[PDB]
């Protein structure tokens, strides 16, 4: 399961200008398709929790079965089912790769995990939906210095979280504490998320 197609329809038709399918924009007067200032704009009263469900689902590149299987992992936490769900999306191995500055998107952060170039504690972990438990580090294999695309990330510093130790070129990290909100996200409440699932 993986989302492909780098066209801006994820940004422009949703609305938000995040770092997803294309950081720039070129057909700025329009939305995708013939949907535009020309034609019909379909709104709803349940589209205010749809677009707090659809706002994240393309961000990590995850399917529908992943969120509901992670919405009730926060049920194992002492907060409510909508309170720690963004924390468990902030603790996966994929978005910690891009948090360490070792890849250039969250989606480039899933490319360099499964192909073995980024490991954990020496043992070959190749899972983008791997949960980073506290007290662990981030590893690589011995062939991780020749590649230009890590050296691309050595060229440009991308993103700094608060729950880590920050190494953009050494390719090893440290998960010091469980995250909170407004470190990985910046724009989403934990109240419009949960109402979609009822």
């Amino acid at each position: 399961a993986r989302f492909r197609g780098s066209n801006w329809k994820k940004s422009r038709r949703l609305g938000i200008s995040l770092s997803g399918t294309g950081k720039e924009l070129e057909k700025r007067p329009y939305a995708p398709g013939q949907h535009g200032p020309n034609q019909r704009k379909k709104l709803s009263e349940y589209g205010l929790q749809l677009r707090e469900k659809q706002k994240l689902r393309y961000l990590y590149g995850m399917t529908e079965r992943q969120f509901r299987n992670t919405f009730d992992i926060a049920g194992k936490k002492f907060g409510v089912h909508g309170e720690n769900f963004m924390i468990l999306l902030a603790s996966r191995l994929d978005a910690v790769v891009y948090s360490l500055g070792l890849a250039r998107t969250r989606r480039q952060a899933r490319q360099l995990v499964n192909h073995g170039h980024i490991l954990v504690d020496g043992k070959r972990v190749d899972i983008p939906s791997y949960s980073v438990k506290p007290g662990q580090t981030i590893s690589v294999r011995e062939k991780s210095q020749k590649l230009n695309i890590i050296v691309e990330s050595v060229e440009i510093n991308n993103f700094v979280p608060e729950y880590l130790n920050f190494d953009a070129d050494s390719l090893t990290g440290t998960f010091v504490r469980l995250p909170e909100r407004s470190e990985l996200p910046a724009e989403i409440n934990e109240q419009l998320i949960v109402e979609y699932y009822s």
């Binding site: 009263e45 929790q49 907060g79 409510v80 089912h81 909508g82 309170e83 934990e190 109240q191 419009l192 949960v194 109402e195 009822s198």
Partner: protein
């Protein structure tokens, strides 16, 4: 400044008796997201001009709702006539669930709680008057601590 929503409109009159009436109406809830709401009804034949008459009718109505900053203080079955909604406090983090007429009133007082469903409500006017009759009857601890002992009960 406040916030308004158009809950429902109609096209209510008698067609031809020799002279035509075909009027509209509205039922607009107004609010401020601090704990004061209201609702009112006007009518006119030009389509969005009856909304400004309807918001005019609701600014003269304010209803103060107690709050423990996210939910309600206790549970109650807000009943008026043929309508009856049920409302009960949640834990902070779960959002206001629907009941669409009852959905938009609870967000304009400023809470995040559960909402049990409309039990016997049918039409979207008596959902609103049963919602407001529920909200204006809750109780604080302090006003209870007025006409009792002074906060013993925990």
């Amino acid at each position: 400044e406040f916030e308004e929503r158009v809950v429902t409109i109609n096209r209510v009159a008698k067609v031809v008796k020799g002279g035509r009436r075909f009027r509209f109406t509205a039922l607009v809830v107004v609010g401020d997201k601090n704990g004061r709401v209201g609702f009112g009804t006007g009518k006119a034949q030009e389509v969005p001009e009856a909304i400004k008459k309807a918001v005019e009718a609701a600014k003269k109505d304010l209803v103060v709702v107690p709050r423990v900053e996210g939910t309600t203080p206790h549970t109650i079955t807000g009943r008026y006539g043929s309508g009856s909604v049920f409302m009960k406090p949640a834990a902070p983090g779960t959002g206001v669930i629907a009941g669409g007429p009852v959905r938009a009133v609870l967000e304009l007082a400023g809470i995040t709680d559960i909402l049990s469903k409309s039990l016997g409500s049918n039409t979207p006017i008596n959902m609103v008057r049963a919602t407001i009759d529920g909200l204006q009857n809750l109780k604080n601890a302090e006003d209870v601590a007025k006409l009792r002992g002074k906060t013993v009960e925990e």
